[PDB]
């Protein structure tokens, strides 16, 4: 048909690259460190975690 | 007391060279079917001199197989010496 | 544990349960999905895709069973723990509280090359 | 002299599997006498009664 | 991470799922692409190394070493194509699958986060390699290469699992390298030698000492078509790096007994290269290079004191290419003339003029002209191993002589007049002959421009 | 005829269910006394002059094997006079239990038998049933478990996994090659047994599967090694990738499941700080592998297809549950830290 | 400047993500040191329901006045 | 039982070389017998009543080796220094190669016996010396 | 006129209709039990 | 593995013949009977591994 065989597979990447983003929510447990490492007042630590 | 060392020396009736050998298998199979009475009598005293009153049937059940089963294994000893006419433990054919 | 010869007792109510889209349950029956494809190939099917009524009913079986079995596994590792802390909690005499100290204290060896 | 020492292991064992098969052939008497040595030799030897 | 294992396992049904002969080009096309992903999130730090998950830090470590591992895969199908076109497609679908089935673990290993994923994956090969050697051999001596390849590799790597399960329950948990922040030393006993000796000797039996290499030319002399898995088995060997994860720590302070591994491989380095001069079979001649200036790392690793790791890393991937590529030449020149006997092929260099400069740039990088990686990977060896004791300059200074007569004698054997009887050897190296022979010297020399990307932490 | 063969073949497990279910020394006599009574006719079916010179070398070798036991039951009826099933209260009991019970399993000695029966039973069909008799006795040893002289059950073990190893390297008939290396795997599970006796069963189930799926494969016609050469170019090649996907996994290599018992067992046998025992076991199962390699160089090397042999017909055997097992005999390693906490 | 903010992050993650997963760890070396200080060595107490064994069941005993005055 | 071996050990390890060796030399021979005697159950015979004695001719040993091994340490013991060192109690092993060589033919044993029965001596001492256990419980 | 048995065909389908139903019948029930119990 | 079904459901397979003092149909004792009810009373709530000591 449309050749599912072909480049449909590279879509496996973003499939996977999302999974590496599934964990960061459960690895949040430290927002606190002294090395700057701040998560101090900003809306930066707030994103990505 | 003493009756427990006889019969015990009797229950070394096993003696195994004379348990499988030498030929006339019927002698081997024999000292087997009389390996009982060393199991029976020995267990017909300890049950008895002290009153267990309950295991007393066990002596009966030590025969009812000892005859039933040992009478099976006689059967084969026809099949061996049917095809031969002499038992003679000296048949080895299946090897390893 | 208790209520012997039970696949799982009533106490497993409090566990999540292990619902689908976990890689294993998908993987479970995958190893069956590569099993079905065999099932043809032994006899010279020679389809390599043969009737979907054999080429399915496997995948149906595994993941159901793989699922229905994972429900108790996760349980067991819970009753393992449960029975540990509750013992670790009592007999505090067998469980000391270590002190706090490191730098300015400990010496190591000290063996450089 | 690298190949003598290690492949000596090859033709070391493969011979001892010729003494565990060849010399055991046959004679149902010959096994049975040897269970008896084993069942006594466990008496004298060691912890087995202790 | 899953960014990698998932597409490369997604490769697996990119192949059979396809049609007839489109298969080769189908997978060679994609298999290159993954190399963008290879660099993609990698070549981050640097300092305070990358660990992105619980059980994976892909490679941080400054042992990048993984980018190559993802090269050599779609260098095979350009390599392996020659005589594998002569049997069936459902078997040809296999040989591409197990070959991937290797490539999937070498991504798992080199990360491993720990010791005990390493091992079960350190032994997890030999299922895929052993099957490529025994089938699709050439001679009938192959059947013994099947055994010898085991019964060493597996022979002494079981004493790992006796030792690594001994550490797991002794001090804390080995679950993670990145926590060694508590490590006590190993002082001495008649027990601890064994511990150190058990945690070591399994690795040596891969990167050979001058003993117990008895397998290495047995498997390479007779081995699959293209060197198809012979290129891979020159990755596998150097992957004994993990001794870099241990001997840095985890019994640091026994150097006491190091000497039987120094003077044993340090006098073999001057040795087995010299038993390589009279060889009459060419794929043997290269197989003994591979011992020699590989076995120099074992005197780089045992000594502490970086400037060795500056130079020990560059070597694992130094011959990682040069020693790869030579097995690619000696393959090609064998397609046309069916003896591997070195003598027989002479009077070339007239008949294949463009392939002249291919031999040369190969045989020139064992000479190690100064600018390339090779010397800048050797001259951090000599600088620290000199300070060890001044006398190391002699033997490993001799290594730098016999190796030069070594290489040339292989080229200069192919400069002669021979017309002789050959009506064969017509093909003037159709592109794949010179295409797959490139993608080595182009990427190899190139790195010398910014050669801070091959270095350890030190 | 055909009904009873399911009455007999049912009474076996009824012979071994009274073994695992019972409190009472008498019943564990009657229990595996009626196997040696109810096994025997299965051997027969084709009435040949081997089976009948086989089951008679079996019979009287499981006759005494039992009949000693009844002597080591009635010893501790004297002392303590309490039957049931627990440590044996007296050393002449146990030492007359465990080293006269090793006859049914046969361990390091007491095997001139396992090759004399398994070879040349004309019935190869099964002969899978000689995986029951591994399962009756163990279901004593798990109970009696805290009484052994402890210098023995290892001394029959370590003289076993060795002696069953070397036994086969010299063998061709492949009913023997399974006969041998089935003493071997009786070396691992009763070497553990005093330390943490579960993680034995683990090796007991993984064993009942793997040896099971061999035979069901060895059933089409297959008999002698050089009749497994005429296999791939004749019957089906999808068969050969199977017999290579197990025989390797059965000695075991870590990506398979055959590596699963060892990998766990040594977690147990060290941590008890015996590290000089397991290497010698760990290292001896090595040359237990060189049967299988060199068995597996028979079928993938295309060795002289038999002769002009034309089998155009399809198959009608019973593969029953073979289309499962080598997805559970292989791929299960990735799955389970269950086996230590599941059966426990 | 264009790439670093297009792809990966700085020591707001690959630092103090290790902080994150070393409390998924140092609690895994707490609970493998308390088995081997309990399981392996219980010991002579056989206290906790681990090395516990069967003994005999005192339910099945009989208290009735059986017939013989002395027993 | 644990008996003999234990007795010797809790005897004269490094000193009182006489009783020890006299024991280690007699126990080796005793062990040797066992195997010779065993050879009659599994292996048969043909030289009649006296034959077993003839058979024993091949086992006319073990005892010799046992004696010698003890003797080496007996002679040594307090010799040059403490023969208690790992490398030392070795020495009793190798003389063994020579022993077997003497017993039968040459080149194809006497080294190996000296070699391997050399290698496996030291471990014993080295074993209890670090406190190793082969058969244990938690 | 394809000739399977047309006897059993659909049982395996019908059976799975039971199992998944019964599976979730135990699941959608037991999910609340955790909270009902906790 | 010892399942102990007769514990779960109701039946008695054996459990009666087991020990020296249970019933004895007309209530007649053994000689050493009186020391059973003494010795079982000792180790019951015990786990038998400390019983020996
Ligand atoms: C790179 C390093 C370059 C410097 C070393 C190479 C020396 C020049 C060379 O190749 O001599 C070939 C020459 C070939 O001799 P031949 O066998 O008689 O010629 C047979 C054929 O004609 C085939 O041999 P050839 O002589 O004809 O060589 C082919 C070459 C001949 O035509 C040329 O253009 C001459 C190339 C010389 C400079 C090459 C680029 C320099 C940068 O054609 C090309 O250059 C193709 C274009 C490649 C452009 C590459 C652009 C960057 C990528 O000599 C050699 O074989 C040895 C070369 C190595 C010299 C020693 C190197 C260490 C000092
Ligand atoms: C009348 C009942 C008939 C019982 C006969 C059943 C045949 C048994 C054949 C055994 C084959 C070998 C597999 C052994 C593993 C047993 C698995 C198990 O114990 O789980 C039983 C399961 C769970 O077992 P469990 O954990 O509740 O308690 C027993 C566990 N063992 C036996 C290991 C001590 O029972 C169930 O309720 C599942 C339904
Ligand atoms: C490789 C051979 C040895 C296998 C050792 C175990 C590797 C898998 C472990 C993955 C991480 C883990 O902890 O498992 C729990 C994980 C927990 O999930 P997760 O959140 O960590 O997701 C990670 C999954 N991976 C790593 C695959 C992206 O669950 C899984 O087991 C994942 C399911 C796939 C596991 C197996 C994938 C197949 C890849 C190998 C194929 C060929 C192997 C040889 C077969 C013959
Ligand atoms: C598990 C509990 C113990 C099972 C071990 C083996 C049980 C086999 C019983 C019947 C075997 C037999 O005799 O078949 C021969 C017969 C052939 O006998 P035949 O060819 O000589 O003649 C047949 C004669 N009639 C027609 C009367 C039947 O059938 C077969 O050909 C198929 C072999 C059976 C396949 C094995 C069944 C299970 C295989 C996987 C086991 C998985 C266990 C789960 C692990 C957890
Ligand atoms: C892994 C997760 C662990 C749980 C595993 C659960 C078992 C999986 C259930 C599916 C097993 C498939 C099977 O039973 O055999 C396959 C095949 C029957 O497939 P079918 O769709 O009925 O095709 C009929 C065409 N004539 O059958 C055949 O090949 C021949 C026909 C015989 C049918 C046998 C049916 C048996 C069903 C129950 C099997 C239970 C025993 C499984 C053995 C291994 C268990 C570990
Ligand atoms: C040779 C066999 C001799 C091995 C001696 C016994 C090993 C040993 O005792 O290990 C020492 C130690 C574990 O024992 P232990 O001292 O009691 O640890 C203290 C625990 N609190 O520490 C350890 O855990 C070390 C255990 C791993 C050692 C296993 C490997 C030892 C032998 C490896 C030989 C190397 C290759 C030779 C074999 C290849 C050829 C067959
Ligand atoms: C597309 C399938 C392959 C191309 C057509 C198949 C031709 C065929 O029938 O051969 C089967 C072949 C078995 O190999 P062999 O027996 O050595 O070759 C002679 C057999 N004609 O190859 C086989 O099919 C054996 C079966 C092995 C397991 C199935 C793999 C076949 C590949 C196609 C399906 C792949 C599904 C896997 C998806 C991802 C999982 C990794």
UniProtKB/Swiss-Prot annotation, chain B:
Q: How does it assemble?
A: Core subunit of respiratory chain NADH dehydrogenase (Complex I) which is composed of 45 different subunits.
Gene designation per UniProt: MT-ND4L
User: Which Enzyme Commission number(s) are listed?
Assistant: 7.1.1.2
Gene Ontology biological process: ATP synthesis coupled electron transport
Out of the domains of life, which is the source?
Answer: Eukaryota
Enzyme class, spelled out: translocase
The protein, known as: NADH-ubiquinone oxidoreductase chain 4L
Where is this gene product found? Answer: Mitochondrion inner membrane
UniProtKB/Swiss-Prot annotation, chain C:
The UniProt PTM text for this protein says: There is a minor unacetylated form of subunit B14.5b.
Give the GO terms filed under biological process for this record: mitochondrial electron transport, NADH to ubiquinone; mitochondrial respiratory chain complex I assembly
Compartment(s) of residence: Mitochondrion inner membrane
Family the entry assigns: Belongs to the complex I NDUFC2 subunit family.
What is its biological role? Accessory subunit of the mitochondrial membrane respiratory chain NADH dehydrogenase (Complex I), that is believed not to be involved in catalysis but required for the complex assembly. Complex I functions in the transfer of electrons from NADH to the respiratory chain. The immediate electron acceptor for the enzyme is believed to be ubiquinone.
Can you state the subunit structure given in the record?
Complex I is composed of 45 different subunits. Interacts with TMEM242.
Where exactly are the transmembrane stretches of this chain? Answer: 51-70
Entry keyword annotation includes Mitochondrion: yes
Q: Which organism is it from?
A: Bos taurus
Instruction: Identify the taxonomic lineage of the organism of origin.
Output: Eukaryota, Metazoa, Chordata, Craniata, Vertebrata
Supply the name of the protein.
NADH dehydrogenase [ubiquinone] 1 subunit C2
Bilayer topology reads: Single-pass membrane protein
**Superkingdom, taxonomy of origin:** Eukaryota
| GO CC terms of this entry | mitochondrial inner membrane; mitochondrion; respiratory chain complex I
Q: Which UniProt keywords apply?
A: Acetylation, Electron transport, Membrane, Mitochondrion, Mitochondrion inner membrane, Respiratory chain, Transmembrane, Transmembrane helix, Transport
From Swiss-Prot, chain G:
The keyword Membrane is annotated on this UniProt entry: yes
Q: What is the superkingdom listed in this entry's lineage?
A: Eukaryota
User: Predominant location of this chain?
Assistant: mitochondrion
What does the record note on quaternary structure?
A: Complex I is composed of 45 different subunits.
* Family, as annotated: Belongs to the complex I NDUFB5 subunit family.
Briefly, what is this protein's role? Accessory subunit of the mitochondrial membrane respiratory chain NADH dehydrogenase (Complex I), that is believed not to be involved in catalysis. Complex I functions in the transfer of electrons from NADH to the respiratory chain. The immediate electron acceptor for the enzyme is believed to be ubiquinone.
UniProt protein name:
NADH dehydrogenase [ubiquinone] 1 beta subcomplex subunit 5, mitochondrial
Part of the full-length chain shown: 119 to 189 of 189
Swiss-Prot record, chain H:
List the record's Gene Ontology CC terms alphabetically.
mitochondrial inner membrane; mitochondrion; respiratory chain complex I
Modified positions (N-acetylalanine) are 1
Q: Where in the cell is it found?
A: Mitochondrion inner membrane
Q: Provide the topology term for how it sits in the membrane.
A: Multi-pass membrane protein
Q: Where are the transmembrane segments?
A: 21-42, 57-79
Say which domain of life the source belongs to. Eukaryota
Name the keywords, alphabetized: Acetylation, Electron transport, Membrane, Mitochondrion, Mitochondrion inner membrane, Respiratory chain, Transmembrane, Transmembrane helix, Transport
Which BP terms does GO give this entry? mitochondrial electron transport, NADH to ubiquinone
Where the protein is mainly located, per its record? mitochondrion
Which family is annotated? Belongs to the complex I NDUFA11 subunit family.
Q: What is the protein's quaternary organization?
A: Complex I is composed of 45 different subunits.
Q: Relate the protein's function as given in its record.
A: Accessory subunit of the mitochondrial membrane respiratory chain NADH dehydrogenase (Complex I), that is believed not to be involved in catalysis. Complex I functions in the transfer of electrons from NADH to the respiratory chain. The immediate electron acceptor for the enzyme is believed to be ubiquinone.
Name of the molecule in the record? NADH dehydrogenase [ubiquinone] 1 alpha subcomplex subunit 11
